Design a protein around this ligand. Structure first.
Ligand code: HEM
Ligand SMILES: [Zn+2]
Ligand SMILES: [Zn+2]
Ligand SMILES: [Zn+2]
Length: 437
């Protein structure tokens, strides 16, 4: 027996569009889901989406025999500059599978071990910056995390040094990036100007490589095993842009939210700092030591639980079907996975879903399939997941070895939305524990 699905207030021809007249549309949607439950329809003029919030409905949506990745209207706007890069391609677009096969080697275990020294390079630059602040100074958390994470993918991926810690404002490329991503969010000469800046740097990266084993090596020289074709010049440049953005933005948000939760939960911070001091006995962390930071890894997952920094991903029905035994869908219908709501499903997590308890992740085998999805789903899941988590674990472990932290402003959480989530205005003071590196 068919259920009629909930839908918020409509506004004539504009349908539900005016309900997201806000700088914080994901957070607005979360409130709608709190009101309406596990599924609601959301309409705009010539656009329909179904927003899902329960693990029960989301686990069905994650059945790849039945649903494939959709390019949401957001990703459609990002495609204006990222083209048919890996994140903004259809699964059966020729360059998706092709680029996937060519670029997988760059996220192998050998690649990761290879990346570790270069991650350590940038993490050291972060710790040094904070060791070198005067007594009266404070830290702009998301701003420095963005310095760290941009520099890390730049170095590891492309052997290009943005030198973000050498500049008092964001790198040109970031300023243009935040502006294009804010445009794409709002849209739902400046936009062509932002893309100008982005694309000028891509050329500088390729040209610099022309002056002679990483992501770019593979982009430029790897051949698809299925065909022996390498990527073409246009796609490669879409990939560089893709990896530059995807490779830093969400990670910077994760490290920010993580430090936020640690300072708001000082006993959790204590427990994480004890592991860091215990494991990290050497001047910098080894690849192996980072893997030994179990509790620090649990801290990051819990942070991704509460505030998944890529808040949504979108699917379409491969055929006419029924979702949840109740809601008929037509072939092509878009389902949007509302990750922060999934992650607050009390039937999965218990009633204490707002509490920051990394101990939830102690026995990750206790977590039901499709309960925890900060990195997307299936064959289109995040290719950089291990990269992001090793980076964040490394860095957070080093922050916890080197500094005691003070929430000197009693910061009230304010989540800025671009397409990703980040704490805005998060500031702390860090007091060095005086251990050299
Ligand atoms: C904590 C940090 C990260 C989060 C939460 C995250 C999240 C996600 C999500 C949800 C998707 C799927 C998007 C969709 O279904 O439309 C995705 C895909 C992707 N991510 Fe990540 N990501 C992170 C870090 C990274 C890093 C560090 C890289 C690069 C080194 C990266 C590169 C990509 C790429 C290229 C895709 C598209 C993969 C494909 O569809 O073939 N991401 N990520
Ligand atoms: Zn398919
Ligand atoms: Zn290689
Ligand atoms: Zn049909």
């Amino acid at each position: 027996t068919i259920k009629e699905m909930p839908q918020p207030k409509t506004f004539g021809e504009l349908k539900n569009l005016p309900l997201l007249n806000t700088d914080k549309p994901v957070q607005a949607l979360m409130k709608i889901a709190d009101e309406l439950g596990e599924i609601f329809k959301f309409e705009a003029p010539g656009r329909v989406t179904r927003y899902l919030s329960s693990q029960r409905l989301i686990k069905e949506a994650c059945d790849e025999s039945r649903f494939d990745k959709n390019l949401s209207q957001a990703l459609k706007f990002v495609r204006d500059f990222a083209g048919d890069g890996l994140a903004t391609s259809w699964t059966h677009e020729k360059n998706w599978k092709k680029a996937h096969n060519i670029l997988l080697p760059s996220f192998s275990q050998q690649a990761m071990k290879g990346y570790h020294a270069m991650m350590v390079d940038i993490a050291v630059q972060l710790v040094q910056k904070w060791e070198r602040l005067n007594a009266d100074e404070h830290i702009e958390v998301p701003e420095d995390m963005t310095r760290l994470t941009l520099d890390t993918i730049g170095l590891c991926g492309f052997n290009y040094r943005f030198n973000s810690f050498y500049r008092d404002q964001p790198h040109p490329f970031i300023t243009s990036m935040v502006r294009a991503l804010d445009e794409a969010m709002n849209k739902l000469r400046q936009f062509q100007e932002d893309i100008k800046v982005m694309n000028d740097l891509v050329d500088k990266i390729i040209a610099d490589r022309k002056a002679s084993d990483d992501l770019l090596t593979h982009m430029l020289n790897g051949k698809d095993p299925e065909t022996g074709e390498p990527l073409d010049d246009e796609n490669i440049r879409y990939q560089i842009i893709t990896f530059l953005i995807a490779g830093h933005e969400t990670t910077s948000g994760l490290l920010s939210f993580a430090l936020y939760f640690l300072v708001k939960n000082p006993h959790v911070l204590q427990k994480a700092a004890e592991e860091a001091a215990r494991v990290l006995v050497d001047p910098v962390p080894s690849y192996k030591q980072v893997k030994q930071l179990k509790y620090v890894g649990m801290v990051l997952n819990e942070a991704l639980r509460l505030w998944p920094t890529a808040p949504a991903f979108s699917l379409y029905a491969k055929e006419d079907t029924v979702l949840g035994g109740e809601y008929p869908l037509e072939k092509g219908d878009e389902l949007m996975v509302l990750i922060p709501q999934l992650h607050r499903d009390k039937t999965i997590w218990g009633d204490d879903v707002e509490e920051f308890r990394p101990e939830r992740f102690e026995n990750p085998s206790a977590i039901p399939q499709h309960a925890f999805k900060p990195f997307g789903n299936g064959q289109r899941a995040c290719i950089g997941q291990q990269f992001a988590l090793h980076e964040a674990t490394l860095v957070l472990g080093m922050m916890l070895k080197h500094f005691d932290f003070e929430d000197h402003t009693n910061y009230e959480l304010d989540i800025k939305e671009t397409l990703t989530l980040k704490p805005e205005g998060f500031v702390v003071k860090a007091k060095s524990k005086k251990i050299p590196l």
